[PDB]
Symmetry: D2
Subunit: 260 residues, 4 copies
């Protein structure tokens, strides 16, 4: 249980980040959520965290592709919470194309959000954690932080970068009561992946669920998606005392992806 | 919670394995323990699991350096428990010397226990798990399954072997409800490590606690030992639903060892 | 021998890149060099390649922190050479500081040059190599593309990114006659490292050569620098037929850094 | 060129080891070959090395699954050569079956040859190299020393073990003029792989060359076999001065296998 803890989850209006926020709230943490979406949906999400789980929840809109906005977001989050114990750097985007066709603006956007925002968020959070002598920074990388696939140059580069940055963060704060680790999921059926399933279905001329099976079979030996709830559970484990000496490392929940 | 589950922990009369057995019993699992020691100590350990935690506990003496004894041990364990849900392949030994001086009998003994017993135990357990469509095989490797140190040829080879074997086990049983992962601890202050601290203290002419600090500083950026209780917690996480799609991978609790 | 081949080496006015250009010229390749420095030194370098080794050499000044300048540089290089067979993405910078103090402009500059320029250069080169059905892209990463050190967040992130990007490039061009690999040096005594030796010497109050020994001892088990000439040799190997099926991987010349 | 050098290649009567011996002889090294086969074929191989390449060649029959025979083989090899500069630990076998069906005798045989012989050969060679202050130990691991496939428990365990042992050897002899590295091939069309192609062809009901294409497509993005000649070239590179500070690491020639 994380009763009293103060958590921030970037990109928590959808997908994995939404489940992270839910699992941290369930465990007793106050939570700042963040990301894009319909205002009515986001306010329902925020108010739900409070009314279900009896914690405080805040939504702070910040486009984390901007460095100063990211650093300002962390300051505003810490002010809202009255502290900052757990930072989950989760927000991310995807774009698929071969390198020689890969849009320069998409490279920049993916590096900005998927890598640089992790740096800027970490930089802003660390002094708060260092002063209190406890912290968790939990970076959501990918199996694509450890291995590659075709047509994902920017994303694989960014996620490999996050895995490196995780190690540095850990080493710089070794022994201080602050850990930093990277959760490296395989496929999780969010909108980020549904777009890729749709693309396969159009390429192959097959129904969406046949396409989902093809997407899994290529990469993920279990032939089952990882769930957002499972990843929330992993984050709660990383936040626990059992993980006090788990730092600078990757926690792969990927159905066997990286085993082969 | 693991209520109803049936667990086997090899080398659980000391050190990490003893804490594993305790944490699994606390979670509600019946437990088979195993290993060498004083009969009075082992029976106190066994009876303690039952009287504290209200589970069934059995001690089965088997020297797991022998293949047939290991396979027979798993059969006897499953018979005692009435099943076998969770196998923790933990028993291990250490011997330090440079390669050209490394005793051939010590190479054989370390390979037999630290690697081959993991194969034989896994082979015996798998058909039981496959029939029921659920299982956890949790191999205790090391940071030395991922990187090396001097004067540990056999041990590093064995532990790298365990990490490879873990991946194969996972892949062969992908999707079946059975996962296999390797917990890779850094330094944990058990008798296996106390011998090495003592050796440093004699080499350097320093007290034992100064030697322990030197042993940590060389390898483990946090400058803190990993605890058996933390590793028990990791095993309980691996045994949980959150880890259903965690398979074929390493879970490093090593204070930053492998980050640098 | 690489007789007839057409090579481009970024950041080849100093250090490792200068030796790369020399070794490729020695092997018979025409070479485009690139980077900052004194005009008289750079023209001596260029004319030396021609007069010693009997190849054609061109200097193209381009600040590769700019995407369009990098893509334009590759076009101009290919025009000068009459082709483009081998691209060595080598230019890089360093800055050391803890994350919470790490200048945002230095993060941006290191990501721009050490990572993004590798993407932009690769993107520009690939269509030329794809049309001819042969190519080598040789990325100069680091041991810090595989592991981390303190106070090098941007650099470690970038170099991990390069290692990921290398894998994608390889996979996208698998079987086409084009390979992409990352050379991952340990310490090499260039100006990039001499600054860090100087910083250690000031911190510890020791002479420069004692500081160099300390810098090695921390990271590099051989206690010897890797040389630019050795790395040139590695590049010539990667460019050879023996390495036709070496692709998507790292070639560590690091004196044992990543073994422990 | 390796003129004057004295090399030993285990399992060099077939496949990769035969090409290793050839490439080392071409470079000017005297060579000891080893392995099973028809006496007339082996003597033709031995005499061919001498008559083509003008070096001395010796065949020493030793079953390297036996520790003492392996240590005695190295002594006899060094006596024949008048030294020992380069040891290539190459001999290996394969057997495919799921873990719960995997013959205990095959596990033992694969561990004995593919792992333990590397230890025993290294142990015997090292004192010779240490006395002269120069050496190369080149271990032939596999992509299966880094990742896994189904039905190869023993082999993957052994090859992961070799990769670990390589690191220890390197670290123990860091700075001494002795390096140790592991060449990690992907598929190479030797008899060891032809058996597996034949098995696929029977399973799928397809001709042998269609089966070979299937075997490649599953694992090896280039869709081309690695050749024994390429691997010989890699060994000659590792034996060169350019590789003086390459130690404790893996050299993957695997057509992209480990990139994804
Ligand atoms: N889905 C998968 O299979 C998978 C696998 C591995 C890793 N990941 C990673 O998990 C993380 C979450 O991905 P997801 O699958 O839940 O995707 P998603 O698209 O469902 O959610 C992305 C979240 O990020 C937010 N967001 C996007 N751009 C933003 C910006 N500029 N600033 C602030 N917030 C922003 C979105 O509004 C949303 O809340 C990403 O880092 C992704 O790379 C996903
Ligand atoms: N202590 C550390 O720092 C550390 C770090 C990483 C991994 N490990 C691993 O953790 C595992 C447990 O080690 P530990 O530190 O608790 O050591 P330990 O010596 O305290 O415990 C070893 C256990 O194995 C048992 N055992 C020994 N030989 C046996 C045999 N032939 N058959 C059956 N049981 C046998 C012992 O009786 C004991 O119960 C080992 O695999 C070790 O390699 C330990
Ligand atoms: N020196 C080491 O120990 C070491 C170790 C591992 C990797 N590396 C890598 O090797 C590569 C070369 O480093 P080095 O040690 O030779 O450093 P160096 O400073 O000697 O050389 C850097 C080169 O890059 C050029 N350069 C710098 N900024 C540039 C820009 N914006 N555009 C174009 N060119 C630019 C410089 O003019 C110079 O030619 C770098 O990528 C570095 O990260 C170095
Ligand atoms: N072929 C591949 O695709 C591939 C890929 C990666 C690694 N490897 C490795 O390359 C090495 C050589 O394999 P190969 O494909 O050339 O196989 P191969 O069967 O063609 O050659 C094996 C060699 O080892 C010898 N040998 C076998 N048992 C022996 C024993 N007990 N003592 C002494 N010598 C013995 C054989 O006589 C033969 O000379 C092996 O270690 C193998 O694991 C092969
Ligand atoms: Cl792919
Ligand atoms: Cl060491
Ligand atoms: Cl460090
Ligand atoms: Cl497989
Ligand atoms: Na892989
Ligand atoms: Na390391």
């Amino acid at each position: 249980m994380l009763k009293g803890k103060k958590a921030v989850v970037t990109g928590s209006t959808s997908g994995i980040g939404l489940a992270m926020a839910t699992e941290l709230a369930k465990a007793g943490a106050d939570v700042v959520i963040n990301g894009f979406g319909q205002p009515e949906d986001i306010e329902r999400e925020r108010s739900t965290l409070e009314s279900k789980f009896g914690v405080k929840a805040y939504y702070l809109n910040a486009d984390l592709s901007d460095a100063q906005a990211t650093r300002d977001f962390i300051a505003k989050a810490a002010e809202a919470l009255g502290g900052l114990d757990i930072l989950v750097n989760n927000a991310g985007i995807q774009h698929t194309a071969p390198i020689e066709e890969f849009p320069v603006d998409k490279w920049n956007a993916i590096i900005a959000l998927n890598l640089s925002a992790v740096f800027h968020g970490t930089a802003a959070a660390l002094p708060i954690m260092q002063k209190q002598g406890w912290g968790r920074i939990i970076n959501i990388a990918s199996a694509h932080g450890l291995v590659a696939s075709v047509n994902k140059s920017a994303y694989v580069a960014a996620k490999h970068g996050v895995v490196g940055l995780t190690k540095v963060t850990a080493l710089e704060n070794a022994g201080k009561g602050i850990t930093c680790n990277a959760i490296c999921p395989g496929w999780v059926r969010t909108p980020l992946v549904e777009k890729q399933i749709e693309a396969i279905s159009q390429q192959k001329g097959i129904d969406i669920e046949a396409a989902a099976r093809e997407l899994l079979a290529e990469k993920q030996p279990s032939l089952q998606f990882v769930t957002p709830e499972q990843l929330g559970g992993a984050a709660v484990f990383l936040s626990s005392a059992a993980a006090d000496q788990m730092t600078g490392t990757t926690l792969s929940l990927d159905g066997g992806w990286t085993a082969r």
